[PDB]
Design a protein around this ligand. Structure first.
Ligand code: AVF
Ligand code: AVF
Ligand code: PLP
Ligand code: PLP
Ligand code: NBG
Ligand code: NBG
Lengths: 790, 790
């Protein structure tokens, strides 16, 4: 109740924050309130953990390098059904609640979708009452802050721990050592990884609060530290440099020794802690597969596999065959990646230098892996070097996905189509050998963070009509199909959008130099910037539109506001270049009042979960315009649907099964299918053809190359054109023409408000499958093999 | 009260530590207790600080690179009068209080006694109700941890923030920018320090309670913060590398750029924080000195004199003369040093690169300074080069002691004989010009930490016989003179010592492979290992003793336990050596079966404030045996006196002033006075003329040299024998015999329970003056010009 909440808020401001109402900052109130919000959870965290300890269900362990968690404060109140009363306590206390919430930093401990997937899974696993966890690295700087400075991506540190974190609590008694380097020794009492360097891993808890169920899971994030003088003391910095900055590589393997360290680290820490827990409970190690599932979130924690064997073989002195069994049983692999540049393939010297014992264990696991394929395909020899864990060209390297397949019991992909590819195509060699290991698990997105919270309009609207069990069991949204008729309703829906759009448009005017049209069509494309996701393909169409206003501004133009945004990797020079252009484009279209209020181009600086939380609800057109067989699933494409945005997108990623739920027409699919792509790959890309045979496109590409958007520096964008004309693996022009045509389709619909809305009500009803609650069930019944409750 | 304490202890363990009692760690227990004790101190911390802010009384600023603060939990309980009520509360929750208390890490951000002076005064300014602060660097690593591996001091990272510190509270809103390097432009709007490099200073406040008085002052410590990509992030360390480790140079100037940075870092932050606050008060800047006082704690914070002067002329745009009149008005200097290697001589090159504006001002200040003397002494050519702020000889070196004097309105030494020599001999040139500037403030120790805390026993018995007036006014301990022939009070004193002895005897028996005689005379030299302090002298007597056992193991040898402890500085090979010797001797001693329970010798591992609080209370003899006129005062000595230990020691430092109060009969003074040494330097201290002249000494030296204590490494010690014979500034031989003769009187008087005890009582009675509460009164009156209140 409000009153005792009012009290709790002040006892902290006094005792924890040492402040009078007279002198408290905006920050100080947040902490006072956050502590109040942590307080009423501690109860159900101890019990929940206590319970999973007392009773031993099979504990889940989601081991990931990335947990894109965003903001905890509001989310926890919502999930703990304490928001309303908290909002009320802060009101009576004449404080601005929004203000306090914005003080809180993004736990930007992840790059993109996989990061948010690791996050959303946490939320559900709790809301499902599953005894799950969360194993990860407590990075001191997350994903970088993105500043638009002279139309160029500028990065800054994500110094989110500068002032602190009320959500985390250190667990010193559970601190563990981790070893790096040294030599392997071969002796009589078995084999010893002698003479090694030690980094302490200090584990920090953060509560994953179930959605109104009393379950409160742990999320364990680890941090580093060490066991003339001055310099030697200063040199401890290198060990505490393993947990410092998270790597900013969305779909790109950059094999840096520090990263390699980061990997092992979060893996040795985890498996040690996990093993301790098993033995700590009411249980040799025969029982271990039944007591622990470890989901390897992608190849990233591949190193866990050889580590588990290490801890068995070298430490439990358990006999190999038996230990190699349980590792397979325990572990599983969700494969997130396709693009070859996103596959972790580690130089061996590196591994020989850093983790020599794990190289003998990878060289060993590989050995047998081939001893079987030679007793299953004796004549065949190309299959051998096609399945080995070692790629024996120039610099020899380990395939980490190969190790995860030979090391797991269930490999999966992240959406039907993608998984279909992983199984039958990408790994046709392993799958044939035992197909029952490869399965699919289509991604999701907790309707808590992404509905209840961020669009409380929609969440409430739907709540007044059809109960609120849909927040627990989301595939209830179908019950809005009965509202397809209702006049009042469609117009009621459109209101919620308009509200969202207006409040977002204010933000957009008070941040940038742009008159935002509050009744225009919101075109949004937000994610990591990448040639594969085609923000460029978008960009051209944005130019294309400008080109339709000049020739004729008097034609009734469907007024739209383009909003592209996303963090380009530092290393990714090409993506940064796409941004500059996008911003350059933005500069021509914003100021040129020949067009004026008809079309505006906003690039969203520093896009992060809390910013996604805001823009998504105020969107009309989701842009999911990747290339045939690039997007593995997307988690973002899902939200937009669940938020009243129409999706423009390719028959790629979960966009495919998104149509399979709403209907192929209710989504704007265009461009070439994975088959059409493979057809043109046979014929091979010939960029010029469309440049010749497209009276419109060519102009766009002349304006880029001549210097319409960069005059004061005409060439600049040459780099781009060289990729577009000779090296475009994602075929920007090839699907330009379908896209532009499929863009008019959307424009012509948006004229009719009563129709768009109807096509929207269809999308929002048929977004039930994409509640991450479902994914988890699937994962539960087939991979981890556990049972939900409360 | 008893009950609420219990509830908040249980309440805190529950909500802050998120533990159930079932699994709560020893450490969780401390933290809950810590937090509970803090809560009854917050309300006063806020009032105290608002009071100052409101009424605006003149504010004292102790500017120091060192606060040897120790633990806070026990002290804080004491001053809030809560120890008793918390001893009960913990007792009832079935936990052992004593145990929790040792979980706390020593906030040892100090090298030695100078470090402890800064801490002691914080306690006293708080009690004397004064509006004072303490500004220091919040070193991530304090003075290192010390282990003994194969009889050697091993350094270890004092990692005191690993687990976190409940007694600081960050101040994210009082954060300040600091500047380094760049260049100096002189412009139409005064001069400009541009192109500079930026570190941030984030302040962390700590309560400094008063002893039962409603004033809880502040101590404000600062840590450093920043304002390939992966590599750029890691490089931020370099910045935070300025608050990283405390320099372990006890009485030594190694001049490292990092330290120069530490020194500007603390000072720059300190000054700006003082100013901003003054500008925030009721108060152009002509009020300033009447509102602010900065004591300069040795030269270390010297960069302030120009730093202010920068802030004064360049920011506030004040006319030089005005800025200078005020600089000296607000800065008061404490000289702590005697040795020529512990003066801070900064090489201009360095001070050019890192702080080029401050070098300008250091020059200008010095130009006007030579102006004065040219004016008075137009023929004294050598005086100008002597009294300058620059030492032109070779690489130009800034004498920083001059910097303080010239820019302070008061320059003090720490003892009668100290300030004395500093007035007439070490600084004659300046005091002849301004005799009045130079004064004395005899050092003192805080009797809350060094009686109420580390010694309930005395504190009680005293507080039973002559009440508790004596804590706040220690000069009451003369009221104890009335009991000199009180046989029972005498016998109840020896018992307090006994228990302290026995408890501490248990400390020793559990920490070492050595049996303690419960009735041995506790002989304790605890103090940073230094040639000048002559631990080596002590050492030699330990040998001289052992031989008096060999020469006839049937003679009555008075059983004594020699306990020597201190930390050799990393650079100090000669200290680290002497340590190996003591240990070497120790082994032999505690191992020759022919002694047994006649003489035990232990080195003190990791001697620190907390561990001082143990040994000190259980001592009979305190070695205060530096070579005459090498100790400015000492503070160690002072305790032992006030814990019923008789001193044996040179007429050096404050040991003289201890004789003044108690009378020379009641100390064991020995050796040569400053003048006796002087003559032996006018004579020349030819070293070997003793090893011939004294039979016993010969044997001791021949044994250290020929290998008695070093069979395996026989020449190991040569480095010392050589130093003794050929490079002994501190004349270990010269005062040997005197010491050894003096030693007999100790051994003899000890055999007289009544005579000894009577003496011990005279000491504790006369100990009155050595209150750091009296030292404050003197500082407050004749330097800071401020009044105590409540
Ligand atoms: O509530 C506080 N709290 C603290 O000052 C305080 C905060 C901490 F985070 C801490 F760790 C210790 C203190 Cl003491 N102060 C306060 C309350 C008022 F109602 C009016 C004035 C003040 N002043 C006190 C002096 C301060 C200064 O000079 O910097 C400014 C604020
Ligand atoms: O009281 C707690 N408190 C926490 O576990 C706890 C501590 C935190 F610092 C935190 F931030 C969150 C929790 Cl939930 N636990 C507890 C209480 C009991 F009465 C009995 C057992 C336990 N268990 C829970 C499971 C642990 C494990 O899985 O290793 C072991 C301790
Ligand atoms: C959502 O997953 C999301 C992403 C990735 O979105 P896509 O899967 O590419 O659609 C990136 N950044 C944030 C903040 C998200 O919430
Ligand atoms: C106490 O004063 C103390 C000292 C002082 O040593 P000396 O006066 O130099 O003998 C040094 N170190 C610690 C930890 C102390 O508590
Ligand atoms: C390496 C990586 O970040 N992979 C990403 O994984 C997420 C979550 O499965 C997918 O939505 C996305 O298509 C894919 O690019
Ligand atoms: C350089 C330094 O730390 N000097 C020390 O200052 C303390 C504190 O006053 C004196 O007791 C002592 O004589 C001296 O060793």
């Amino acid at each position: 109740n409000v009153a005792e909440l009012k009290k709790s808020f002040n006892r902290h401001l006094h005792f924890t924050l040492v402040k009078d109402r007279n002198v408290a900052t905006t920050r100080d109130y947040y902490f006072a309130l956050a502590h109040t919000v942590r307080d009423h959870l501690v109860g159900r965290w101890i019990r929940t953990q206590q319970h999973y300890y007392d009773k031993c269900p099979k504990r889940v362990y989601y081991l990931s390098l990335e947990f894109y968690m965003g903001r905890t404060l509001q989310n926890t109140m919502i999930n703990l059904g304490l928001q309303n009363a908290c909002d009320e306590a802060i009101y009576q206390l004449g404080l601005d609640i929004e203000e306090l919430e914005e003080i809180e930093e993004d736990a930007g401990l992840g790059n993109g979708g996989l990061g948010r997937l690791a996050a959303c899974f946490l939320d559900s696993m709790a809301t499902l009452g599953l005894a799950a966890y969360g194993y990860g690295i407590r990075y001191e700087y997350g994903i970088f802050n993105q500043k638009i400075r002279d139309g160029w991506q500028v990065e800054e540190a994500d110094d989110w721990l500068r002032y602190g974190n009320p959500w985390e609590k250190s667990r010193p008694e559970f601190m563990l050592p981790v070893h790096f380097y040294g030599k392997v020794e071969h002796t009589n009492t078995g084999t010893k990884w002698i003479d090694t360097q030690v980094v302490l891993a200090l584990p920090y808890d953060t509560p994953v609060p179930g959605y109104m169920n009393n379950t409160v899971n742990t999320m364990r994030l680890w941090s580093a530290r060490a066991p003339d003088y001055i310099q030697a003391v200063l040199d401890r910095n290198l060990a505490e440099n393993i947990s410092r900055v998270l790597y900013p590589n969305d779909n790109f393997f950059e094999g840096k020794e520090l990263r390699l360290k980061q990997e092992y680290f979060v893996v040795a820490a985890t498996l040690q802690d996990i093993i301790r827990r098993f033995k700590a409970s009411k249980f040799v190690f025969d029982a271990f597969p039944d007591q622990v599932a470890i989901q390897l979130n992608d190849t990233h924690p591949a190193l866990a596999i050889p580590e588990l064997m290490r801890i068995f073989v070298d430490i439990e002195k358990l006999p190999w065959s038996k230990a190699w069994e349980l590792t397979q049983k325990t572990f599983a692999y969700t494969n997130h990646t396709v693009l070859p540049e996103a596959l972790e393939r580690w130089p061996v010297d590196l591994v020989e230098k850093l983790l020599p014992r794990h190289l003998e264990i990878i060289y060993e696991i590989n050995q047998k892996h081939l001893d079987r394929i030679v007793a299953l395909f004796p004549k065949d020899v190309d299959r051998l070097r096609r399945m080995s864990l070692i790629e024996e060209e120039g610099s020899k390297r380990i395939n980490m996905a190969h190790l995860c397949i030979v090391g797991s019991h269930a490999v999966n992909g992240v959406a039907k189509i993608h998984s279909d590819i992983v199984k039958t195509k990408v790994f046709k060699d392993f799958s044939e050998l035992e197909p029952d290991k490869f399965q699919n698990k289509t991604n999701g997105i907790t309707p808590r963070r992404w509905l209840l919270l961020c669009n409380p309009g929609l969440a409430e609207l739907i709540a007044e009509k059809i109960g609120e069990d849909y927040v627990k069991d989301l595939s209830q949204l179908t019950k809005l199909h009965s509202f397809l008729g209702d006049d009042v309703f469609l117009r009621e829906l459109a209101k919620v959008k308009q509200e969202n759009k207006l409040k977002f448009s204010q933000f957009l005017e008070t941040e940038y130099k742009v008159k935002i049209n509050p009744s225009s069509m919101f075109d949004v494309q937000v994610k990591r910037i990448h040639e594969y996701k085609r923000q460029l393909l978008n960009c051209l169409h944005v130019i294309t539109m400008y080109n339709r206003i000049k020739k004729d501004p008097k034609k009734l133009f469907v007024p739209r506001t383009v909003i592209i945004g996303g963090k380009a990797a530092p290393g990714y020079h090409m993506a940064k270049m796409i941004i500059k252009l996008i911003t350059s484009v933005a500069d021509v279209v914003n100021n040129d009042p020949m067009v004026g209020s008809k079309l505006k181009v906003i690039f969203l600086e520093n896009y992060r979960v809390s910013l996604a939380e805001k823009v998504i609800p105020a969107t009309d057109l989701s842009e999911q315009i990747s290339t045939a067989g690039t997007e593995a699933s997307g988690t973002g494409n899902m939200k937009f649907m669940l938020n009243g945005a129409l999706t423009i997108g390719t028959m790629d990623g979960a966009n495919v099964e998104m149509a399979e739920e709403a209907g192929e027409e209710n989504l704007f699919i265009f461009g070439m299918r994975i088959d059409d792509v493979a057809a043109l790959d046979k014929k091979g890309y010939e960029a010029k053809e469309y440049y010749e045979a497209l009276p419109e496109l060519k102009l766009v590409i002349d304006q880029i190359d001549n210097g319409f958007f960069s005059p004061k520096q005409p060439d600049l964008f040459k780099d781009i054109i060289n990729m577009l004309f000779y090296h475009d693996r994602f075929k920007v022009f090839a699907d330009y023409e379908a896209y532009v045509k499929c863009q008019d389709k959307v424009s012509q619909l948006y004229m009719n408000p009563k129709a768009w809305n109807t096509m929207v009500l269809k999308n929002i009803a048929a977004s039930g499958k994409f509640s991450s609650d479902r994914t988890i069930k699937e994962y539960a019944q087939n991979i981890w093999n556990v049972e939900p409750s409360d």
